[PDB]
Write a protein that binds this ligand. Structure first.
Ligand SMILES: NC(=O)CN(CC(=O)O)CC(=O)O
Ligand SMILES: [Ca+2]
Length: 279
């Protein structure tokens, strides 16, 4: 399949060079996979989600995305126009409030929730969890992300936006999950992207068009926007049978575009998420 005039990030994950405009992907599109977006929520009524989105859990007085961040991230995963995996099932877990904050205790409870809840859902191609959140180093936060991954979910987490080594942030610094840095449409490391040996992979993270609350759309930037590209890619590859939850981060790094990014520090991987799709 081909999406003409796609958001640059989508075009970028289907090309070996920057600057293209069509997103080419296999039509299976993540069908039969499931991606838990653990964030401020998902506006599942947005027409872009085509009924494929639902809230399954909130830790606040409402399950509504009053912020927009989780709806944006969910749209990069699996919206019809802005998503990598256009036929994936999306589940919202609201661990962040409408200002975008959440206590680590809440975030950890959300991760243990998903490890259990996936057992009450039909996800025959497998389960991914996208975590565009984090704060300072926490061994308990890292532990929770490791359990989620060990339970059989492909965990993708934001490297963070501190232009610093991700070793000092969580869940970015948990080695067993997939830690995602951000790039821009000229193949530079994004100005704010964290870096470090613990990064697994980069995805598109500067100026990313996606869904927004109130049935709308907007462009925003962050390792939060790169993470759902990687989460969607894993869903897509899992549906295609080319990888499993346990091995997907490795597979994506194995098959990445290599050495394309500029301003990558010594000791950080120069790998950009790539779907190797051949019409
Ligand atoms: N979402 C991100 O990675 C960074 N951004 C994105 C945004 O929310 O507009 C700022 C923030 O989170 O404060
Ligand atoms: Ca890792």
């Amino acid at each position: 399949a081909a999406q003409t005039n796609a958001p640059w990030g989508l075009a970028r994950i289907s090309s070996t060079s920057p600057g293209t405009s069509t997103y080419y992907y296999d039509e299976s599109a993540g069908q039969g996979s499931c991606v838990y977006v653990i964030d401020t929520g998902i506006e599942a009524s947005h027409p872009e989600f085509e009924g494929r989105a639902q809230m399954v859990k909130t830790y606040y007085y409402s399950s509504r995305d009053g912020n927009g961040h989780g709806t944006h991230c969910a749209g990069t995963v699996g919206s019809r126009t802005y998503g990598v995996a256009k036929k994936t099932q999306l589940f919202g877990v609201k661990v962040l409030d409408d200002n975008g904050s959440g206590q680590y205790s809440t975030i950890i409870a959300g991760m243990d929730f998903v490890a259990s809840d996936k057992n009450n859902r039909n996800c025959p191609k497998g389960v991914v969890a996208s975590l565009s959140l984090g704060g300072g180093y926490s061994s308990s936060v890292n532990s929770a992300a490791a359990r989620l991954q060990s339970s059989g979910v492909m965990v993708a987490v934001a490297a963070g936006n501190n232009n610093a080594d991700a070793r000092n942030y969580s869940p970015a610094s948990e080695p067993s999950v997939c830690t995602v840095g951000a790039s821009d449409r000229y193949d530079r490391r994004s100005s704010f992207s964290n870096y470090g040996s613990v990064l697994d992979i980069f995805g598109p993270g500067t100026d990313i068009l996606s869904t927004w609350i109130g049935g709308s759309t907007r462009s925003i930037s962050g390792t939060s926007m790169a993470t759902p590209h990687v989460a969607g890619l894993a869903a897509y590859l899992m549906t295609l049978g080319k990888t499993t939850a346990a091995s997907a981060c490795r597979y994506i790094a194995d098959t990445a575009n290599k050495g394309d990014l500029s301003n990558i520090p010594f000791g950080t991987v120069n790998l950009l998420a790539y779907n190797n799709y051949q019409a």
